[PDB]
Structure 1
């Protein structure tokens, strides 16, 4: 007797993985948005507004990520950033229709793990490389980069679980925006537990 059927949990995770993006300059398109939001995790898809009479978007779009943590970082780091001369606005989807309690439950369950999300991981870095660097903040239980199911090549992001909460807190504070391999890592605390639907 926990909270949220696997089906309810999956629906919440889906909503948690998308961010609303508004005030998009008329000349900007999907490719621009993608480039700007990709640093937080590879973009799964983008739903861009569109008007058939004017033949242009309506100034907003929904960017969907592969995991909730990417949307959380984009939310905290991309709001008010200037794109095409306008400060874009980023927010959570206004539609949640009763999903909020499940989302809250997931966030609560997440606190039971000292797990952090790391994005913008250079292609040449390996699991062991990431582990070594990050174990500088404390003992690590596991460090795993997400990988393409077909190629086996990592997708530029992963999760690291620490034995101690102090270690995870230190890592986030020190490694978010850390320049590694030419790009800047984006790092944040997990917003969901490791195997949410289990």
Structure 2
């Protein structure tokens, strides 16, 4: 009935509470550069120098058993994940730029 759902407000609406009741802990990154040959271990080996990865979820064509090109990597430390994003976004690994975004920007 009630319970307002609205995130079309670009920022500010999320961080509104002066004490911040939740969030700020773990963080999940969106990495897109996996041209059918970049594995979980390769990504992790590049990202762990920053901190540590809890789980790596890659998007792959279960239809034929191949990598679609993008995956979500979950870090325990937000700041570390943000740092990995901030340095690796644009990095050429396999002769191709590394697209790393913080998942949500314009959801609603």
TM norm structure 1: 0.41
| Alignment map for 1:49-198 (pairs within 5 Å) | 49-94=59-104
Distance 1:96 1:37, change over 3 A: farther
Q: Deviations over 1:104-161 (max 9, x none)?
A: xxxxxxxxxxxxxxxxxxxxxxxxxxxxxxxxxxxxxxxxxxxxxxxxxxxxxxxxxx
- Where does structure 1 lack aligned partners over 5 or more consecutive residues? 99-198
Q: Secondary structure at the match of 2:31?
A: strand
Aligned CA-pair RMSD: 2.4
CA–CA distance in structure 2, aligned partners of residues 97 and 25 of structure 1: 26
Higher helix share: 1
Unaligned runs of 5+ in 2: 1-15
Aligned to 1:46: 56
Q: How many residues align?
A: 92
1:34 and 2:44 aligned: yes
Assess, with a 3 A threshold, how the Cα gap between structure 1 residues 13 and 93 changes in structure 2: closer, same or farther.
farther
Once residues 20 and 80 of structure 2 are traced to their aligned partners in structure 1, the CA distance between those partners, rounded to angstroms, is 24
SS of the residue corresponding to residue 47 of structure 2 reads: helix
For the Cα contact (< 8 Å) 1:49–1:61, is it kept in 2?
A: yes
**Does structure 2 retain, via aligned residues, the 8 Å contact 1:47–1:62?**
yes
Q: Is the 8 A contact 1:21 1:62 kept in 2?
A: yes
**TM, length-normalised to structure 2:** 0.72
Equivalent residue number for residue 5 of structure 2: none
Q: CA deviation at 1:28?
A: 1.2
Q: Give the greater-gyration-radius structure (CA).
A: 1
Could you tell me how far 1:94 is from its partner in structure 2? 2.6
RCO greater where, 1 or 2, for CA within 8 Å and sep 6 or more? Answer: 2
- Matched residue SS, 1:41: coil
